[PDB]
């Protein structure tokens, strides 16, 4: 009934409290649960939901055979209530997509689902599940987008898409979407930057995006912009490097740190003045563990000193993609935009001996109150029957 | 839309009528049903729901292997409609928790879910499924709470939490929670009392809690308090001892009866003037059977004389935890707060030869009208193929 204002700033936050956990894979041992990946969260003014990409197959069935290329015509984007297992019986269909995004504007859901061939992919935009627009690949090379929630403000929702090489210069676009129709589109001019899999959030009527540099940066690149798509760019300066893989922590850069800069994971961070809350794997070579770190001058300064770290998943357990999501005043009752986050806990291939690959998920929400480090890992015993 | 007044007294009640039974374990023989425990009930102004703790695993699947410690990071608090099997397909996610409580204030649900390490557990409070507060362990020793419904009155909800040893003096707190934010917290001064797993209910704008003494009492301890957390304390005087294990009935005490006072079960009772309705196992050594007893002067007097007993589960059948829950006028239409109760019927370990441990549930509601003794046991044939 009413569009989200998005005009307040981010809630101050001293730590992260556990919010959900689905246990998908443990349950899927016997239940009817989808093989999934990219399990992001996004919230309405009424409820929070997890969105995900199915291969269109169930844990412990032959069609979970992972020989299928990542971008198949079977892949679809679906959603289920937060913390429930993604099951064919409790899940809503959203889009035919092998790359996706989603957000609610206070009135309805927007979804963005990219399918088609590598040289000609089309994003289809729906608003209340009705197709409202489309956009074709413009560099003819794997049009792709966030794998997490877009950000809405003042009745407009905002996303980032990338088309081009994943290991060289590519083309980056920001879009302003209104009621599921693209109303503005800007190609960023960012030579020597790589933007992929952006985690965008709203904060005082502007959007900020922390993304993945898959070409040559082990710190994360950021882009931020207002409702007119007047933008700025950079990289997180903290020497607590955010990507994976990455070197050991040392003096950072405000441009891409080339050292172990190739490849990466979807990740996120939250800006607070000159400070930054950083989410990252614990391992430096591999997608293992997860910790949150507060670096008071980390956004704009290049040292290693941080004030506090909070454990989320032990170094010895499997993690994967991570992403931002927020809860607005319109949902929470607060005077500020509450930052949360979710973590994909990848099981199966390539690191273990199975024919398949599936995520479980955890999430936390930031609070300015008591919290504790722990490990909340997937917990499925592998391999399975199949 | 309107907060529960909680100002009327408890409905007079001559016996207990059957309300629900889920048959979880019989059905789970084939269905997709969670391994569960702590299966308590709580009611809104619109519907009653059963809440429960999953290990995140299904009956007849390898992950039901009960080698997992009780307080794992896989444990979560979920709910399903009353009398339906707790299934991944029909259940709502609530909190990541290995100890929990829940109640509705007339406007929304509050949930309380404790997770984290033994030396640093955090309770996370949600209101309409939004995190609204948290509280850390203050004795650094297994912060834990009711395993049944909190009690709400006049827009405030009330609970009890314990931190410390389970076999010596510990620390007991009562809390006043308002819209999911803790607004008052009192540490009770009760030397030589042990409070655990409290069954609290409202009655004339005050809360009364009957709990478990796991240190040295086979009668149950009580604490009662008003909205300002001005409290009083004692133990149920009746010589019809309430806990399990316990001695044979003889003269009671208004302090802890040390005889067979170690260990126990979650239980409940309802106060009526000097009288008491007592729920208890039938066996004196083991968690078998269940009966309700009316002892007219049992709250404040120490003899064995009771006026009536009503059978619920035969001595020969398995039982387990039990707990209060009530139905307000705002739900029922009545001028009084109706007392009900639920019984966990534990199957599997440690008493039987399975790798797992799961509850079924039954419930009854008090009426001032005709009723009958019977036995309504679990009825699953053990073991299962796993």
């Amino acid at each position, epitope marked *: 009934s009413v569009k989200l204002a998005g005009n307040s*700033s981010l*809630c*101050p*936050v*001293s*730590g992260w409290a556990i919010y959900s956990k689905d246990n998908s894979v443990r349950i899927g041992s016997k239940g009817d649960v989808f093989v999934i990946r990219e399990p992001f969260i996004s919230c309405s003014p009424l409820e929070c939901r997890t969105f995900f990409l199915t291969q269109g197959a169930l844990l412990n069935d032959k069609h979970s055979n992972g020989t299928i290329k990542d971008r198949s015509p079977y892949r679809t984007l679906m959603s289920c209530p937060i913390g429930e297992v993604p099951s064919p019986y409790n899940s809503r269909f959203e889009s035919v997509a092998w790359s996706a995004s989603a957000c609610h504007d206070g009135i309805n859901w927007l979804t963005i689902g990219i399918s088609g061939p590598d040289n000609g992919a089309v994003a289809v935009l729906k608003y209340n599940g009705i197709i409202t627009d489309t956009i074709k690949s413009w560099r003819n090379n794997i049009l792709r987008t966030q794998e997490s929630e877009c950000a809405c403000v003042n009745g407009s929702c905002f996303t980032v898409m990338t088309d081009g090489p994943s290991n060289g210069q590519a083309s980056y676009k920001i879009f302003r979407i209104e009621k599921g129709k693209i109303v503005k589109s800007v190609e960023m001019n960012a030579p020597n930057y790589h933007y992929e899999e952006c985690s965008c959030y709203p904060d005082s009527s502007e959007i900020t995006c922390v993304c993945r540099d898959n070409w040559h940066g082990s710190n994360r690149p950021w882009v931020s912009f207002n409702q007119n798509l007047e933008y700025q760019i950079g990289y997180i300066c903290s020497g607590i490097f955010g990507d994976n893989p990455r070197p050991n922590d040392k003096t950072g850069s405000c441009g891409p740190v080339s050292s172990n800069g190739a490849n990466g994971v979807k990740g996120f961070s939250f800006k*607070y*003045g*000159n*400070g930054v809350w950083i989410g990252r794997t614990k391992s430096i070579s591999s997608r293992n563990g997860f910790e949150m770190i*507060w670096d*008071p*001058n980390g956004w*704009t*300064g290049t040292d290693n000193n941080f*004030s*506090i770290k909070q454990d989320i998943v032990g170094i010895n357990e499997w993690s994967g993609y991570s992403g931002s999501f927020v809860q607005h005043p319109e949902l929470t009752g607060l005077d*500020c935009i509450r930052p949360c986050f979710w973590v994909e806990l990848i099981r199966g291939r390539p690191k273990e001996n199975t024919i398949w690959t599936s995520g479980s998920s955890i999430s936390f929400c930031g609070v*300015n*109150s*008591d919290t504790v480090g722990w490990s909340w890992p997937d917990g499925a015993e592998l391999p399975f029957t199949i | 839309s309107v907060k529960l007044a909680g100002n009327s007294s408890l409905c007079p009640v001559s016996g207990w009528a059957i309300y629900s039974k889920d048959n979880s374990v019989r059905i789970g023989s084939k269905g997709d049903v969670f391994v569960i425990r702590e299966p308590f009930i709580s009611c809104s102004p619109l519907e009653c729901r059963t809440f429960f703790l999953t290990q995140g695993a299904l009956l007849n699947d390898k992950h039901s292997n009960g080698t997992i410690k009780d307080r794992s990071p896989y444990r979560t608090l979920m709910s399903c409609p009353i009398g339906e099997v707790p299934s991944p397909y029909n259940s709502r996610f609530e909190s990541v928790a290995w100890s929990a409580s829940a109640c509705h204030d007339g406007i929304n649900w509050l949930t309380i879910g404790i997770s984290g390490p033994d030396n640093g557990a955090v309770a996370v409070l949600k209101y309409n499924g939004i995190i609204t507060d948290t509280i850390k362990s*203050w*004795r*650094n020793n297994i912060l834990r709470t009711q395993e049944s419904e909190c009690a709400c009155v006049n827009g405030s909800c009330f609970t009890v939490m314990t931190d410390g040893p389970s076999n010596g*003096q510990a*620390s007991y*707190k009562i809390f006043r929670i308002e819209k999911g*934010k*803790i*607004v*008052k*917290s*009192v*540490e*009770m*001064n009760a*030397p030589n009392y042990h409070y655990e797993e409290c069954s609290c209910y409202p009655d004339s704008s005050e809360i009364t809690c009957v709990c478990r003494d796991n240190w040295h009492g086979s009668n149950r301890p009580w604490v009662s308090f008003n909205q300002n957390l001005e409290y009083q304390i004692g133990y149920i005087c009746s010589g019809i001892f309430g806990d399990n294990p316990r001695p044979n009935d003889k003269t009671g005490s208004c302090g802890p009866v040390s005889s067979n006072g170690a260990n126990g079960v979650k239980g409940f009772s309802f106060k009526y003037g000097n009288g008491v309705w007592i729920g208890r196992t039938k066996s004196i050594s083991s968690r078998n059977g269940f009966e309700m007893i009316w002892d007219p002067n049992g709250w404040t007097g120490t003899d064995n004389n009771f006026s009536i007993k009503q059978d619920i589960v035969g001595i020969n059948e398995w039982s387990g935890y039990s707990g209060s829950f009530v139905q307000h006028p705002e739900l029922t239409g009545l001028d009084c707060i109706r007392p009900c109760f639920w019984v966990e019927l534990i199957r599997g370990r440690p008493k039987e030869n399975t790798i797992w441990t799961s509850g079924s549930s039954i419930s009854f509601c008090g009426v001032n009208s005709d009723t009958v003794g019977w036995s309504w046991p679990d009825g699953a044939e053990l073991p299962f193929t796993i």
Partner: antibody, heavy 124, light 107 residues
């Protein structure tokens, strides 16, 4: 571990100036109001000043005994709290403490962390 | 401007005795906090919101009261308990502390 290491103390003449500092670690300094409380030799405790968080506009409050002479401030990006003292008097001689208050709504005013403190002597 | 008066100023007790120290207010407050100071160290947070014990405080301690009268009690005093206990309120600006009660061991 949450810690507050203050510094800046010392000997200074009546009418003089001093800038006490406090380095905080172990928590998110930016989310918290902060306090200075002091203690004259042998004499007990006296709150002096309070500054609030960014999200409450860094609002400042002072004890009358210190009003118009002391200024409180913070640099969140460095986790520092400051107390500038001007026009010192022999009365202001005291042990000065950096003090975090409890975030608990149900215990407003509880001061949950103290530093070791820094010593101030005002004498000619 | 809200005043706190603690009594007695000094209190002598044999180990094992029960002792109580009191803190009165010029006008009403919701609750009282207390701190423990030994000479040569910072106060320690001892109790909050009248009755809640700080981590590390042993069960011998308990705290009570309401309106304008509060107290701190030690069921069986031990020698390590010898210190000065200060009460403190923050119901209204400014926050204020009592004058302290100094606990001494008899022998």
């Amino acid at each position: 571990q949450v810690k507050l290491q203050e510094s800046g103390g010392g000997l200074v003449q009546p009418k003089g100036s001093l800038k006490l500092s406090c380095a905080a670690s172990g928590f998110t300094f930016n989310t918290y109001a902060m306090n200075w409380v002091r203690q004259a030799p042998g004499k007990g405790l006296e709150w002096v000043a309070r500054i609030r968080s960014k999200s409450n506009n860094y609002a400042t409050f002072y004890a009358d005994s210190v009003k118009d002479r002391f200024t409180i401030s913070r640099d969140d990006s460095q986790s520092m709290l400051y107390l500038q003292m001007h026009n010192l008097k022999t009365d202001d001689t005291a042990m000065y403490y950096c003090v975090r208050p409890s975030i608990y709504y149900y215990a407003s005013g509880y001061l949950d962390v103290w530093g070791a403190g820094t010593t101030v002597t005002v004498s000619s | 401007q809200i005043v706190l008066s603690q009594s007695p100023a000094i209190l002598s007790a044999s180990p094992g005795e029960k002792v109580t120290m009191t803190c009165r207010t010029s006008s009403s407050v919701s609750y009282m906090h207390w701190y423990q100071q030994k000479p040569g160290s910072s106060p320690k947070p001892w109790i909050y919101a009248t009755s809640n014990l700080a981590s590390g405080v042993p069960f011998r301690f308990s705290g009570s009261g309401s309106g304008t009268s509060y107290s701190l009690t030690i069921s069986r005093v031990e020698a390590e308990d010898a210190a000065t206990y200060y009460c403190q309120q923050w119901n209204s600006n400014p926050p204020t502390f009592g004058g302290g009660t100094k606990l001494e061991i008899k022998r």
